Amino acid sequence: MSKRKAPQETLNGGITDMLVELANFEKNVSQAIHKYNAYRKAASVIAKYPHKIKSGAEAKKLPGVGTKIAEKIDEFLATGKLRKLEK
């Protein structure tokens, strides 16, 4: 908790962070669950991935992800399509 100085709203991706969060549920999705394995594989290829993906097709190329959790990936970067101040 509190290592040096983390951002207030992360940078952009934060994919493996919210994917591992569902695996950390320890209640609705603790261990030996039916969908708990979905986040274990999708998070194994996402966290290895450079993270951050504007187009949803990115999670498609990621092996193990691209059927149900792929929508949750875009959910992270779904409300982060703000502009970057033009000119």
Side-chain angles (χ1 to χ4, degrees):
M1 211 281 142
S2 193
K3 297 286 177 92
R4 214 94 224 307
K5 208 269 212 173
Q8 273 72 42
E9 303 267 278
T10 74
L11 185 76
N12 271 309
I15 310 179
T16 165
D17 271 40
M18 286 214 147
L19 223 168
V20 178
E21 213 192 321
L22 202 167
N24 211 29
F25 249 114
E26 211 164 87
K27 278 212 146 198
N28 214 280
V29 186
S30 162
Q31 281 159 125
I33 335 301
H34 57 92
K35 263 207 270 195
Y36 171 58
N37 267 44
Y39 328 110
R40 183 65 143 165
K41 272 195 184 192
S44 200
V45 57
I46 262 72
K48 261 210 147 153
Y49 212 43
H51 317 121
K52 191 271 210 150
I53 48 139
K54 300 195 214 154
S55 286
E58 299 215 50
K60 214 147 212 197
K61 58 151 273 146
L62 307 179
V65 225
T67 330
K68 211 147 89 147
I69 306 174
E71 207 178 306
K72 203 167 214 95
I73 311 303
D74 210 310
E75 199 171 54
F76 311 133
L77 308 141
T79 326
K81 267 272 177 92
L82 283 78
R83 302 200 137 306
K84 206 162 277 197
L85 266 91
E86 267 172 69
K87 191 151 178 62

